[PDB]
Amino acid sequence: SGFRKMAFPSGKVEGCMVQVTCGTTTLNGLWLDDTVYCPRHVICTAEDMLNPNYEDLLIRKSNHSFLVQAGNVQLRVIGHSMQNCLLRLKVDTSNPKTPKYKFVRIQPGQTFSVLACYNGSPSGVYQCAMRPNHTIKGSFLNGSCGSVGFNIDYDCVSFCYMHHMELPTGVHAGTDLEGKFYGPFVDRQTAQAAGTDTTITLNVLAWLYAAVINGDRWFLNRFTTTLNDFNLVAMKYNYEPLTQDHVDILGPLSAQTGIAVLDMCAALKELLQNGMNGRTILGSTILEDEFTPFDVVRQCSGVTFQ
């Protein structure tokens, strides 16, 4: 029993973290087979950042412009290329700790584990969701760029995020492992602001199922709702509209608990309109939106506490 924000074991990713230095900038990179991946702004200086031209800044670098350090060992760079907002540095050595892996572009509302790293050395692991506004609420200090996000299924690591920067509201922005930003952000020091965010409705519902599976029914009611009527309530409380595809996704959790999705939606609508106040769900005072339906099935018993 119990329910915790839970990260994936991090060892397969730890074995891939290196340090990349260009001039006076040092940050982390990811070493798979014979390539190291890192944020391209490693080639910039501070005044370069206001209005960088990477194609122009990069043509000015050689292979020996980049120092790659794996633990105590220096990796010699033997080629480099830009891919969108990352560099791919070819090194003379294949990482013998390369796990089975894929590069995935994660969708908003999905979760992943972040291994926060400094100077190529892992410092901690936590879980976070891709917000609908394409930011994450991470924990990052200077030198964390190049830290990665990932999910694991079986013994395959799906890398989905590489860290680049922090926005004025204290939230974080970065790219997939093809160097493409999540959201409308660019890698330069210019005014950029996270768009307005919303609550991930699908996740809130999944976590209410979590609560029922773990044995709590207090917030249920005898009502049902149409999808459309729920959505008028959703819009007023700044929740993402619920779709039939989201309803479908909740099928297996619905079946495990015998509670119809639209019945749980009515329950949610009641919680938004009347509050919880005083009461907790899974130890929480508020409605939680950072667990996916998949995160619930992963962690909960496949047997309901009836």
Partner 1 sequence: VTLX
Q: Which residues bind a copy of itself (CB under 8 A)?
A: 1-12, 14-15, 115-116, 122-126, 128, 137-141, 166, 170-172, 214-215, 283, 285-286, 298-299, 301
DSSP-based three-state secondary structure for 245: helix
Which of partner 1, a copy of itself, none does 41 bind, CB closer than 5 to 8 A by kind?
partner 1
CA dihedral 230, 106, 135, 108 (to 10 degrees): -10
**Which of the listed partners (a copy of itself, partner 1, none) does 192 bind, with a CB threshold of 5 to 8 Å by partner kind?**
partner 1
| Residues of this chain, 212-251, that bind partner 1 according to CB under 8 A | none
64 is catalytic: no
- Which one of a copy of itself, partner 1, none interacts with residue 31, CB within 5 to 8 A by kind? none
- Per CB under 8 A, 40 contacts partner 1: no
Binding mask 158-197 for partner 1 (x = CB under 8 A): -----xxxxxx------------------xxxxxx-----
Whether 145 is a known active-site residue: answer: yes
Beta bridge partners of 103: 159
Q: Using CB atoms within 10 Å of the CB of residue 281, give its burial: 0 to 12 exposed, 13 to 18 middle, 19+ buried.
A: buried
Closest CA to 81 of 94, 69, 66: 66
The number of residues that bind partner 1 (CB under 8 A) is 21
145 binds, among a copy of itself, partner 1, none (CB under 5 to 8 A by kind): partner 1
- The residue from 144, 158, 225, 256 that contacts partner 1 (CB under 8 A) is 144
Q: For a copy of itself, which is the closer residue by CB, 62 or 275? A: 275
Q: What angle do CA 177, 22, 56 make, to 5 degrees?
A: 75
How many CB atoms are closer than 10 A to CB 133? 19
Whats the size of the chain, residue-wise? Answer: 306
Task: Report if residue 275 touches partner 1, rule: CB under 8 A.
Answer: no
Structure-block tokens of residue 64: 């020996």
Query: How far apart are alpha carbons 112 and 158 in whole angstroms?
Result: 9
**Residue whose CB is less far from a copy of itself, 5 or 188:** 5
Contacts of 298 (CB under 8 A, 6+ apart): none
For partner 1, the binding residues in 72-131 under the rule CB under 8 A are none
Nearest to 194 by CA among 109, 104, 260, 134: 134
Closest CA to 212 of 288, 116, 282: 282
Which residues does 34 contact at the CB level (< 8 Å), separation at least 6? 90, 91, 92, 93, 94, 95
Shortest approach of partner 1 to residue 147 CB, angstroms?
Answer: 9
Among residues 16, 22, 38, 41, the one annotated as catalytic is 41
9 binds, among partner 1, a copy of itself, none (CB under 5 to 8 A by kind): a copy of itself
Interface residues toward partner 1, by CB under 8 A: 41, 44, 49, 140-145, 163-168, 187-192
Catalytic residues: 41, 145
